[PDB]
Nucleic acid binder design. Structure first.
Lengths: 96, 103, 93, 80, 93, 103, 80, 96
DNA sequence: CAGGATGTATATATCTGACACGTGCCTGGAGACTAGGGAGTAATCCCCTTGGCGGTTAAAACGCGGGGGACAGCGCGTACGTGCGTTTAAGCGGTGCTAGAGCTGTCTACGACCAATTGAGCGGCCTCGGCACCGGGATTCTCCA
DNA sequence: TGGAGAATCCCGGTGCCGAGGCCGCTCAATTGGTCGTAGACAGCTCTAGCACCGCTTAAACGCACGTACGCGCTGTCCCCCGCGTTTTAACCGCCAAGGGGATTACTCCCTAGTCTCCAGGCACGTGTCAGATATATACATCCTG
């Protein structure tokens, strides 16, 4: 069997997803989530498709930046595995 | 009729920038044509810089067309433009960077 | 209706800088948004400058100071030099 | 439209982390990321819905989303 | 020349809320600066809203939307309620 | 002649707020008096809230006068005002807090 | 003027860290803090001098400093 | 001798300086530093005293906030002593 | 526990400058009237939203082996806290003065406003070449040896 | 290194649809002229920013001691990673329905502009009292035992 060492495939995905520019979250679940969230502010809202697309790009960019900061925090604590404490520290420093 | 853009040697429209400034001035303010020329020159220079970096990035990738990926690479590859342009480029991706301790 | 944008002028600048290089529509939209953002920042800074000194007129000096405030470092230096060059050329005609 | 927050699957969060350079991901990271994403979307959607309601419209335009992102210092280029 | 401020009105509000508690000059200046900042934020948001909708007139609707955008949560809700009450009283008188 | 502030039941000046809005309106915009009433009411409400919290903080410290320290305590003690007021208060100091693991 | 950055003495940096809740301080923290303070002052003073030069003045006023701080999202209350 | 254990006077100083509102940096050295820094942008500049005071308050507040973030980072890495890497991480996440 | 020293907390008189108040005046708010431009409302249409159905593969979900990373424990030596003698420069007080901020008066360069004109710019249509997709060959990287 | 094997780069061929160009038309830039205005400059005043000197003393500094903490090393275990098999719902494609957003027209009403009047809010001046200061003093805490 071509059993790879734990981490090699992770590095391959890291290299592959950094060179691509496609959206990573599935479109329909994100659209459903956006509609559910907007249901709390105003009922029976209609969403333009470009609005959902822009929301998806914004959310993905925000999450990528947050994960970059989280990885920095994880490296700071002499770890390679990110943890919820890392995300909490990153968001606290950013002022969120 | 020689246009103000041709008079100032600029590709960008001096008249349109002047009109935009006039309809953006607060409390019936006045705007001089020199301000419009200066602003048009600034916008043209910024366009030229960004397009030069993007064209260099596209040439490095052996393509003849600038895409949002090349714009992202050009913007984040220059410290000054990175500081100036903090917005998110749709479809630009991220600059490939793997931290040293992960290898 | 007629939507006014900087697409034609951006294309002209590109053909001045890279004659053989083309550009996609999405990149044009992104660049147009970027230019609109920069113009908005410059206009806001010029308005603040005019309000601070009680001057109702926004002349080239206000634009120059707003640029020194907004663009950073060598980019601001080159932009100021280019603007002064364009202003001198406009005045001399 | 209920509890569609689980629609952001673990593979999707793993891909998002991979794009950001993360090598290993803990178990609770998926729940933490879902909560953070929900908060961010709540803020942006609230601002966009306020913009839409002011314009007496019932359709959330992409341009309102661009404005909502611009208000919070997260300018987006390409849709406006 | 005379410099206009909000000190008298802040003092009236303080006497309504805390009749027996005074305010120092530094604290009063800080309160005036805070009120100026809030008014500037509301005016900027109202102008942006007017520009977006091509509506040159700024009315109570624009101020309400700006309050909802700027002020957070329950503070925004209570501020909107107070503003609505004030506008209703003004119109009924 | 009665003032608009008295007409709307507000301590803050409706006329001054209207004049300031007219001065700050961009491109010969129009401003209604109702907008001025709304803005004055909201400014008065914010003043009342911040002053109430500051007076409570001052009373907790057995001091009969509001100081910048009390303003800092009141502002950082409320989540909504902390979110709204991100500026620096001169002479306000910091809220005394020491981490659990630091003791 | 030269080497005036050393006028920010180690006791002053220790007091600033104490106000910030810091219990233990490393040796290189003083030089790091001096560099960071120099960068911050460079930015603020550059903006303030730009504002002063626009007003055709040779004297930097508190208004210029306040505007420079406001531009960088560091609004200061207590000086106008 | 009343030799205190290390860190006790540190905690007392933390408690004492947090309740005070006085400026911590000496005024004259800060004024000299501000004049030296401004010498690079425009020669023979005069400084209003209130301008120097406002600069001092802004700088002290900024440094206190930076040290709070630095302490957060140091606690994250299971340490009580702040280090230059903590300051660097804080300034990186803040976007400085 | 338990005593010794202690810095901090508590109490009180001093005063002292900082806050609340009184007065001139002048500038901005209020009242009234006019013109007109912008907001409110209604009708129309068209395309842009939502909803639904078939298929079906590519992705998500679930099991399972397992090895590598997180974490606890221990030693250790090195850097930082603590206290003291001392001096070095900051702070207070005063003085001496001149650069420069601030207000006032002129007036001429300059920008707002309107009308006519025309050419630049924008919307719609067509095409062909650069880029994307599918498949294969060669190149590079990795685990196990 | 070596080999076996997977991943990826490159190389090609074909398609396909998006960019660049062309044309009608439109509406805003341009030019000319007038009229007010504001900012560039000169001038005077008077305020404070700079410089200096003298003295005091509190803080910075250098040093010596000690000990707590950062860090390296080792072991344990548990928990994500990689891979295989099942399932499931996302996406493409197509079709229906309707609703609401954008446009146009009418109306009317609400605000800018101008003039007059007056009162309240802002510089200037004054009294007195709440808190900072100095001193005395109680007390809960740290440390060493």
């Amino acid at each position: 069997p071509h059993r790879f060492r734990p981490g090699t495939v992770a590095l391959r995905e890291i290299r592959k997803y950094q060179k691509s520019t496609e959206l990573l979250i599935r479109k329909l679940p994100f659209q459903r989530l956006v509609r559910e969230i907007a249901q709390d502010f105003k009922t029976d809202l209609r969403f333009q498709s470009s609005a959902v697309a822009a929301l998806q790009e914004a959310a993905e960019a925000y999450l990528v930046g947050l994960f970059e900061d989280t990885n920095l925090c994880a490296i700071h604590a002499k770890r390679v595995t990110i943890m919820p404490k890392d995300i909490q520290l990153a968001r606290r420093i950013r002022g969120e | 009729p020689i246009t103000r853009s041709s008079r100032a040697g600029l590709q960008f429209p001096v008249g349109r920038v002047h009109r935009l400034l006039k309809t953006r001035s607060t409390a019936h303010g006045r705007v001089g044509a020199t301000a419009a020329v200066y602003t048009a020159a600034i916008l043209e220079y910024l366009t030229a810089e960004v397009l030069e970096l993007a064209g260099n990035a596209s040439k490095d990738l052996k393509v003849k067309r600038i895409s949002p990926r090349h714009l992202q690479l050009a913007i984040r590859g220059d410290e000054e433009l990175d500081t100036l342009i903090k917005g998110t480029i749709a479809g630009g991706g991220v600059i490939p960077h793997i931290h040293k301790s992960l290898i | 209706k007629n939507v006014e944008t900087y697409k034609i002028y951006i294309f002209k600048v590109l053909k001045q800088v890279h004659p053989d290089i083309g550009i996609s529509s999405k990149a044009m939209g992104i660049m147009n948004s970027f230019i609109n953002d920069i113009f908005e920042k410059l206009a806001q800074e010029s308005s603040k400058l005019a309000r601070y000194n009680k001057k109702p007129t926004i002349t080239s000096r206000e634009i120059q100071t707003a640029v020194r405030l907004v663009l950073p470092g060598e980019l601001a230096k080159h932009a100021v030099s280019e603007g002064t060059k364009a202003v001198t050329k406009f005045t001399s005609s | 439209l209920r509890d569609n927050i689980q629609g952001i699957t673990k593979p999707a969060i793993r891909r998002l982390a991979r794009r950001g350079g993360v090598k290993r991901i803990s178990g609770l990271i998926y729940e933490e990321t879902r909560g953070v994403l929900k908060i961010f979307l709540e803020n942006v959607i609230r601002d966009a819905v306020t913009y839409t309601e002011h314009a007496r419209r019932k359709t959330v335009t992409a341009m309102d989303v661009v404005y909502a992102l611009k208000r919070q210092g997260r300018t987006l280029y390409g849709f406006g």
